[PDB]
Amino acid sequence: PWVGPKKGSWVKVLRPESYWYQTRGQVVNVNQKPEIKYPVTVKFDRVNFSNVNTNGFALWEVIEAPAPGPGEV
Amino acid sequence: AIFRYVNATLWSKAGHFNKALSKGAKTTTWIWNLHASAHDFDIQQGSAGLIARKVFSSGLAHLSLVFFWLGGMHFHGAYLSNYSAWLKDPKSVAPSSHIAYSLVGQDILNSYTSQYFSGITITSGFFQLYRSEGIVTQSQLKYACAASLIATLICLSGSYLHMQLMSKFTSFYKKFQSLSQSHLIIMFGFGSVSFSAHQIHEALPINSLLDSGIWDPQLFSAILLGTPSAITGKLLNPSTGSIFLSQVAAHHLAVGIVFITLGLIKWCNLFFSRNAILSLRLAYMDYHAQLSINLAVWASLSMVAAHHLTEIPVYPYESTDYPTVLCLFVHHACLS
Ligand code: CLA
Ligand code: CLA
Ligand code: CLA
Ligand SMILES: CC1=C(/C=C/C(C)=C/C=C/C(C)=C/C=C/C=C(C)/C=C/C=C(C)/C=C/C2=C(C)CCCC2(C)C)C(C)(C)CCC1
């Protein structure tokens, strides 16, 4: 079964040190291997200071959220 | 030669030249990098032929810009200046080809320069330059402006054309011997000889008449007539306080002859110590090497100009036009 969020669904990042903390991204993929500490892959339209668009998060660092509306990050 | 590839489609891309700007506008650093690398043709997409194309065409476009600026100066002198009052009596009237509006009380900027003229006193020495050149009529200044504008258009057309005339096979810009010989013999030698001719044939009679006090149209439209045996520079025009323009014309003739002779001896290979400079010749065949060398040469020449324009007086009344001489020195020192 799918351990993490569904592929393509929007997840709100809960990692305090993340550039996208409390903002939402799209789940690119989730690693089903139980040995992966940070399986979920989330991409965001806003590049961070290092011009990086995607990142890897653990199952406890992302929660399911609705897609951003107009003017929402 | 193929001009079907010049289209305005790339105008709206805003960053096509730099591959690092492909991910357009993710931050404001992208805007700043676009501006910073706009004219760094070496790191831009393309080839060495394209780099040469851009360098030469940009040089021509800047030439057109300078010609436009000179034409604007001539137009301001012709129509928005007190050059007539200054010519008849330079001492009483300060040069001014600059007028300001009366928008918000801004008319206060204009100051008394003549009875019928109020404006901003210019400090570029353009009036003295015109007087030395023999320009004494609004028609002459107007035609100088027209020539400058025509030169601007010609240079703009040349830049636009050369952006496509020069192909990847183009190599005329690497012919350093030909470039240097042409510049030394024609641009400098023939140029100086031709300007000496211009002085002798136009400026000398007009300047002599102006010194005497004659302002007759027929006269305005016998070298060494007034110059004594005194060494040039040892005796200044008593009525103008500057080196005799006939001495200046003789100087330009001699300089042109010397430049032509140098070019001809180089052509004949009379210069022998090629090996002492061969290392530099091989090393410095680069855009940035040539740019650095030329910038240093022109900096030194600008400093020498700053010193000489004041210490050695050659323009009429520029010696007594204290703001003009000071501003010229300071400007050319800063450019140096
Ligand atoms: C013949 C003259 C010449 C030529 C052909 C070049 C060519 C080049 N220079 Mg430049 N350079 C020149 C003169 C020249 N330079 C001079 C005189 C200096 C000394 C200051 C420099 C110093 C210099 C540096 C330090 C660098 C270059 C670089 C470059 C490259 C492009 C830079 C660019 O895109 O700028 C685009 C930016 C602009 C056009 C804007 C510049 C605006 C400045 C701040 C001046 C503002 C003046 C203005 C009048 C202020 C008052 C107005 C105000 C009141 C409103 C290119 C190879 C860069 C490089 O890496 O090259 C490989 C680079 O880093 N140049
Ligand atoms: C709207 C403003 C304006 C405009 C359009 C012009 C236009 C012109 N002035 Mg200038 N001028 C101005 C304001 C202006 N002036 C002011 C406020 C003064 C003080 C009274 C002058 C005093 C003045 C004199 C005395 C002369 C000119 C001249 C000229 C011509 C020179 C060409 C040129 O600018 O090349 C482009 C040149 C530059 C961009 C120079 C950039 C670098 C400068 C020299 C740095 C110096 C400091 C700077 C002015 C201020 C920095 C601080 C500031 C940001 C707060 C041209 C018609 C000359 C001329 O021949 O006129 C016919 C001339 O002799 N002007
Ligand atoms: C270090 C000593 C030194 C000194 C004091 C001078 C002094 C002078 N040189 Mg220079 N020069 C030097 C070294 C020096 N040069 C070297 C080592 C070379 C080549 C080996 C040259 C080649 C050279 C040329 C070809 C010309 C000068 C000219 C000039 C005059 C000033 C610039 C000028 O008028 O620009 C006007 C000329 C230009 C703006 C043209 C610039 C040259 C082109 C565009 C550069 C092309 C670069 C190349 C294609 C890059 C390819 C790279 C790739 C293959 C990797 C002045 C007499 C000019 C002159 O009138 O001489 C009498 C001139 O035409 N010099
Ligand atoms: C702008 C300015 C300036 C100035 C400049 C100048 C002024 C320069 C010079 C210029 C010049 C003044 C140039 C000259 C030129 C000339 C020439 C280039 C000539 C040539 C000749 C020829 C080409 C010849 C021809 C012929 C004939 C006549 C016919 C037959 C025979 C024969 C072929 C020989 C400066 C730098 C300060 C910078 C700033 C501003």
Q: In this structure, are residues B132 and B245 in contact, taking their beta carbons and an 8 Å threshold? A: yes
Contact residues, B window 4-23, toward A, CB-based 8 Å cutoff? 23
Evaluate: CB of B302 within 6 angstroms of ligand 4. Answer: no
SS3 assignment for chain B: CCHHHCCHHHHHCCCCCCHHHCCCCCCHHHHHHHHHHCCCHHHCCCCHHHHHHHHHHHHHHHHHHHHHHHHHHHHHHHHCCCHHHHHHCCCCCCCCCECCCCCCCHHHHCEECCCCCEEECCCCCHHHHHHHHCCCCHHHHHHHHHHHHHHHHHHHHHHHHHHHHCCCCCCHHHCHHHHHHHHHHHHHHHHHHHHHHHHHHHHHHHHHHHHHCCCCHHHHCCCCCCCCCCCCCCCCCCCCCCCCHHHHHHHHHHHHHHHHHHHHHHHCCCCCCCHHHHHHHHHCCCHHHHHHHHHHHHHHHHHHHHHHHHHCCCCCCCCCCHHHHHHHHHHHHHHC
**Which residues have CB under 8 Å from B148's CB, separation 6+?**
B67, B68, B70, B71, B74
What's this structure's resolution in Å? 2.8
CA distance B254 to B261: 10
Cα-trace Rg, chain B = 24
- All residues of chain B having their beta carbon less than 8 Å from the beta carbon of residue A51 are 23, 26-27
CA distance A71 to B22: 26
- All residues of chain A having their beta carbon less than 8 Å from the beta carbon of residue B27 are 47, 51
Q: One-letter amino acid identity for A53?
A: N
User: Which residue of A lies nearest to B23 if distances are taken between CA atoms?
Assistant: A51
| Cα A45 from chain centre | 12
The experimental method, as deposited, was cryo-EM
Cα-Cα-Cα-Cα dihedral sign, residues B305, B306, B311, B316: positive
Tokens of B128: 């003295």
CA distance A24 to A64: 9
If you search the block for the tokens 């509006």, which residue do you land on?
A: B101
Evaluate: CB of B188 within 6 angstroms of ligand 4. Answer: no
Q: Phi then psi for A29, rounded to 5 degrees?
A: -165, 165
Q: One-letter amino acid identity for B43?
A: I
Q: One-letter amino acid identity for A7?
A: K
Query: A33: which DSSP letter?
Result: -
Shortest Cα distance from A45 to chain B (angstroms)? 9
- All residues of chain B having their beta carbon less than 8 Å from the beta carbon of residue A47 are 26-27
**Which residues have CB under 8 Å from B259's CB, separation 6+?**
B184, B185, B188, B189, B192
Which residue lies with its CA nearest to atom 12 of ligand 4? B191
Query: Which among B16, B124, B142, B122 is positioned nearest to B78, based on CA atoms?
Result: B142
Q: Does B91 touch chain A (CB under 8 A)?
A: no
Using CA atoms, how far residue B120 sits from A30, B25, B93, B112, B140, in Å, is: 73, 45, 12, 9, 23
Tokens of B5: 């590839």
**Which residues have CB under 8 Å from B143's CB, separation 6+?**
none
User: Which residue of B lies nearest to A45 if distances are taken between CA atoms?
Assistant: B26
Q: Does A52 touch chain B (CB under 8 A)?
A: no
SS3 label, residue A19: coil
Distance B40 CA to ligand 1 centre (A): 9
- All residues of chain B having their beta carbon less than 8 Å from the beta carbon of residue A49 are none
Shortest Cα distance from A69 to chain B (angstroms)? 20
Cα-Cα-Cα-Cα dihedral sign, residues A6, A10, A15, A17: positive
Q: Does B288 touch chain A (CB under 8 A)?
A: no
Q: In this structure, are residues B306 and B328 in contact, taking their beta carbons and an 8 Å threshold? A: yes
CA distance A49 to B312: 59
Give the other-Cβ count within 10 Å of B204's Cβ. 22
Q: Does B28 touch chain A (CB under 8 A)?
A: no
Evaluate: CB of B255 within 6 angstroms of ligand 4. Answer: no
Q: One-letter amino acid identity for B50?
A: L
Query: Which among A46, A39, A48 is positioned nearest to A3, based on CA atoms?
Result: A39
CA distance B72 to B217: 26
Give the other-Cβ count within 10 Å of B185's Cβ. 20
